[PDB]
Tab-separated table of C-alpha atoms and ligand atoms in Angstrom:
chain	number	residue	atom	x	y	z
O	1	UNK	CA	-21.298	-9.671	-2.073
O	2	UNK	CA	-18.720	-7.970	-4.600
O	3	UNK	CA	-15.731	-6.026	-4.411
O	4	UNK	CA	-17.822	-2.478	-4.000
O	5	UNK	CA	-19.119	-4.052	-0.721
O	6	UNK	CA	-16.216	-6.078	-0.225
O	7	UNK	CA	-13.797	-2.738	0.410
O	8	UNK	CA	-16.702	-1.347	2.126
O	9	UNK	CA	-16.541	-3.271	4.712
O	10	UNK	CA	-12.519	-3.161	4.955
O	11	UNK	CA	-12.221	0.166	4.689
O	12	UNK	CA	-15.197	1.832	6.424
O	13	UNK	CA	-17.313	5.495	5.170
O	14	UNK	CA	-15.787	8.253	6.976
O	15	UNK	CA	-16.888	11.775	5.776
O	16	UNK	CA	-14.011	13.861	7.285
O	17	UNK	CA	-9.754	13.904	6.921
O	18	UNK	CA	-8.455	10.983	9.207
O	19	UNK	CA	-5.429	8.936	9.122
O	20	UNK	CA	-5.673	5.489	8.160
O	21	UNK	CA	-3.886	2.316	9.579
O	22	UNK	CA	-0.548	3.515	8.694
O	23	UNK	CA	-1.123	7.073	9.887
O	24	UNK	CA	-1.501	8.541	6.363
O	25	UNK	CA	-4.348	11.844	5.688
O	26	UNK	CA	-7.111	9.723	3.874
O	27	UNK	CA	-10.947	10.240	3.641
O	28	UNK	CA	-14.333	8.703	2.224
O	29	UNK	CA	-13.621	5.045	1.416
O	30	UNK	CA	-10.402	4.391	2.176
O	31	UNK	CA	-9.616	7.371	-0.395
O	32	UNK	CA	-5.588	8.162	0.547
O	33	UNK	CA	-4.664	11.722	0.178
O	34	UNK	CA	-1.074	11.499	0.808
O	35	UNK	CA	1.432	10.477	2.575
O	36	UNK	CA	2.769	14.037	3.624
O	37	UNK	CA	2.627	15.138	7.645
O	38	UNK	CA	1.024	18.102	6.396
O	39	UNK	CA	-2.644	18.134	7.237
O	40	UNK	CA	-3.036	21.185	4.759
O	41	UNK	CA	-1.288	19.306	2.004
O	42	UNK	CA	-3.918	16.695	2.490
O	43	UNK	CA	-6.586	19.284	2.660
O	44	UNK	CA	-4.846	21.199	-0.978
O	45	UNK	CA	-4.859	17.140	-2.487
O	46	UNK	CA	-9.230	16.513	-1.052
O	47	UNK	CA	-10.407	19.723	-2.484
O	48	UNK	CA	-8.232	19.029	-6.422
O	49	UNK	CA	-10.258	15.421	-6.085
O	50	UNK	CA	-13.267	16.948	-5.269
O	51	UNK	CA	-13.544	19.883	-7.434
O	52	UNK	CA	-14.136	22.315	-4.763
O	53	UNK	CA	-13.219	23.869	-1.661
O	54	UNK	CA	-14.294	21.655	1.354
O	55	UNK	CA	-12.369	22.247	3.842
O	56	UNK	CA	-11.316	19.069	4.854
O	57	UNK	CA	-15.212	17.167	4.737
O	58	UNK	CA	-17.419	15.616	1.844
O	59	UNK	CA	-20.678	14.180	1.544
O	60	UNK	CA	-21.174	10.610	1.090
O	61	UNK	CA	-22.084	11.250	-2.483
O	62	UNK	CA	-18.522	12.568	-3.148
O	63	UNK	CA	-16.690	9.730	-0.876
O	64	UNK	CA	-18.747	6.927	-2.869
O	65	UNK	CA	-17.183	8.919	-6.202
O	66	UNK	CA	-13.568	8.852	-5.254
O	67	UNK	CA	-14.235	5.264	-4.383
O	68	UNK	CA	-15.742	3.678	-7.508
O	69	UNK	CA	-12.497	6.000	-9.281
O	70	UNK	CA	-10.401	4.271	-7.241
O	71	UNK	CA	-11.720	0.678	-7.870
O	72	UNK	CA	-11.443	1.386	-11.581
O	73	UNK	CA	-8.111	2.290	-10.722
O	74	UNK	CA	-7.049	-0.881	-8.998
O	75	UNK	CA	-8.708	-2.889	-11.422
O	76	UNK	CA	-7.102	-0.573	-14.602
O	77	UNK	CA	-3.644	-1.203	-12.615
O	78	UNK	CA	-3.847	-4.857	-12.452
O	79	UNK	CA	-4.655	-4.691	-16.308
O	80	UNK	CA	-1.753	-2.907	-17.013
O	81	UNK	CA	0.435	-5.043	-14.903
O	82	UNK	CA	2.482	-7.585	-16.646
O	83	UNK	CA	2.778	-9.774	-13.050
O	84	UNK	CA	-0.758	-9.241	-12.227
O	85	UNK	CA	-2.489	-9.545	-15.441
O	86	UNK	CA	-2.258	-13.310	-16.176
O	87	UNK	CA	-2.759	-13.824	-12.233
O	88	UNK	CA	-6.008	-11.826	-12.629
O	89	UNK	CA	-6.962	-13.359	-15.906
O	90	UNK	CA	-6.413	-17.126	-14.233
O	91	UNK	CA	-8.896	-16.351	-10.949
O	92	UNK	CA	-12.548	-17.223	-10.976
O	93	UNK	CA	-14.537	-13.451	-10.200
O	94	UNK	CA	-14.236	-14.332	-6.315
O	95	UNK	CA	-10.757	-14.611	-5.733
O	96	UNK	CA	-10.319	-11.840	-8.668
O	97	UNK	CA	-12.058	-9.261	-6.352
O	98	UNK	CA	-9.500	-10.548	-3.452
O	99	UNK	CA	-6.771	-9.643	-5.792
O	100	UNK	CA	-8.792	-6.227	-6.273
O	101	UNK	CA	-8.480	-5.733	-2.590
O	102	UNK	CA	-5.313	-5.860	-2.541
O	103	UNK	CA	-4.252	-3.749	-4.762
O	104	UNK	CA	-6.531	-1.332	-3.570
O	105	UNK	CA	-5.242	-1.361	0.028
O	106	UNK	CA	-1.277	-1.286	-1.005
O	107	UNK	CA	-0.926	-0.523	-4.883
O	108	UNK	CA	-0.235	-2.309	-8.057
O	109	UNK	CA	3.886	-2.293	-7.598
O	110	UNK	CA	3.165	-3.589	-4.142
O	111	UNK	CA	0.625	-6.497	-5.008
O	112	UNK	CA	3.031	-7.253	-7.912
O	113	UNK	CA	6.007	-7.676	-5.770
O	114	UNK	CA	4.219	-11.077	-3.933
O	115	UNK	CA	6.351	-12.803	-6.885
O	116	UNK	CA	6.268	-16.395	-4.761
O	117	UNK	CA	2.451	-15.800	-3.838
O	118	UNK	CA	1.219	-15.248	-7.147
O	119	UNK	CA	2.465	-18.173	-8.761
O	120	UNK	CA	0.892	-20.494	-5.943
O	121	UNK	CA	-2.890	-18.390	-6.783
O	122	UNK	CA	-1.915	-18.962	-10.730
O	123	UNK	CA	-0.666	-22.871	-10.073
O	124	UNK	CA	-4.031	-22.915	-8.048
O	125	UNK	CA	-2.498	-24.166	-5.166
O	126	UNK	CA	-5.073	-22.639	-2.568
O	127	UNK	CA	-3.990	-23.166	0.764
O	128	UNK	CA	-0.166	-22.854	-0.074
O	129	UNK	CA	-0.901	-19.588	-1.618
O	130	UNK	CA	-2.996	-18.706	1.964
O	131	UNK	CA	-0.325	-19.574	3.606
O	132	UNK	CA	2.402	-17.749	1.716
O	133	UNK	CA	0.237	-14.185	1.925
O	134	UNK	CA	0.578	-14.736	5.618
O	135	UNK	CA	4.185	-13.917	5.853
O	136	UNK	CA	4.050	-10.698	5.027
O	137	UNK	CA	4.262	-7.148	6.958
O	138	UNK	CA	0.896	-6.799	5.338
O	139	UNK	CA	-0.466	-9.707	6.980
O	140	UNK	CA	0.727	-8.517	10.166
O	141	UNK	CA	0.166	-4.925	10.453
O	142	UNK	CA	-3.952	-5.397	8.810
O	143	UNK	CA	-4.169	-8.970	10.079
O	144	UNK	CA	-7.781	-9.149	10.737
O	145	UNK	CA	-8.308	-8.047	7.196
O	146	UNK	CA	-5.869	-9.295	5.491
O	147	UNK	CA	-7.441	-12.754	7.008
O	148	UNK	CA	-10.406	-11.856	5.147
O	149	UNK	CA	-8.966	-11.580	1.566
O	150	UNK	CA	-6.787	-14.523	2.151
O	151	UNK	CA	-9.828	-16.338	2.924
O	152	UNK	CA	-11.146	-15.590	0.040
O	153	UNK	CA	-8.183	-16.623	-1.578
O	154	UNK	CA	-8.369	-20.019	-0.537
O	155	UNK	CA	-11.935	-20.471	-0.795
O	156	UNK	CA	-13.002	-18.864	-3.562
O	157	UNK	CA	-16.385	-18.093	-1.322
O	158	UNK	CA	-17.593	-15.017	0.132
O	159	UNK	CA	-17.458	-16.708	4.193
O	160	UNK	CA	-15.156	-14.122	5.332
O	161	UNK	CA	-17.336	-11.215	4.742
O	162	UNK	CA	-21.015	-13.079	6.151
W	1	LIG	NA1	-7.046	-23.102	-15.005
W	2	LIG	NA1	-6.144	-6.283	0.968
């Protein structure tokens, strides 16, 4: 396991524009287009990703593209992040990827927000820290996945994603 299959799992391969858990235009890999109503402003966003007119569908080549660019992203973000960075730099590769995850599914300002979650991951204190990402609207809306990552969180194993 690693954070390429990881988000794999979470977020599916789908090769056509479809709305994601929160009803946002998103394809490939959990690749969001935006969060605009307008399925041709999604469309205009897919084909200035892609390089080319496609009308709303890619290959999997293309969807596994936008995806490794957006895990570079994530991890880039969390980098650049003055909350996140000594979080990330304090993790063991396991629960590093979890952190990945997360920022993946709701963005560096979000992740960085969990202010009273990240100092029980960077104190180490596992199942306090499990608990605290529980109370969330994150844990609630994606709860079957967000189990996963907080699993991983206070494990530091891959079990969740057997
Ligand atoms: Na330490
Ligand atoms: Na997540």
């Amino acid at each position: 396991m690693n954070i390429f299959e990881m988000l794999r799992i979470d977020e599916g391969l789908r090769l056509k524009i479809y709305k994601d858990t929160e009803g946002y235009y998103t394809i490939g890999i959990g690749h969001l287009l935006t969060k605009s109503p307008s399925l041709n402003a999604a469309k205009s966003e897919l084909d200035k990703a892609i390089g080319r007119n496609t009308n709303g569908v890619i290959t999997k080549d293309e969807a596994e593209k936008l995806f490794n660019q957006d895990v570079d992203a994530a991890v880039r973000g969390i980098l650049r992040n003055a909350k996140l960075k000594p979080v990330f730099d304090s993790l063991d590769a396991v629960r590093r990827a979890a952190l990945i995850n997360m920022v993946f599914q709701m963005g560096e300002t979000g992740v960085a927000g969990f202010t009273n979650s990240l100092r029980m991951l960077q104190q180490k204190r596992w199942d306090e820290a499990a608990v605290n990402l529980a109370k969330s609207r994150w844990y609630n809306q994606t709860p079957n996945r967000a189990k996963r990552v907080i699993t991983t969180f206070r494990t530091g194993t891959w079990d969740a994603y057997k």
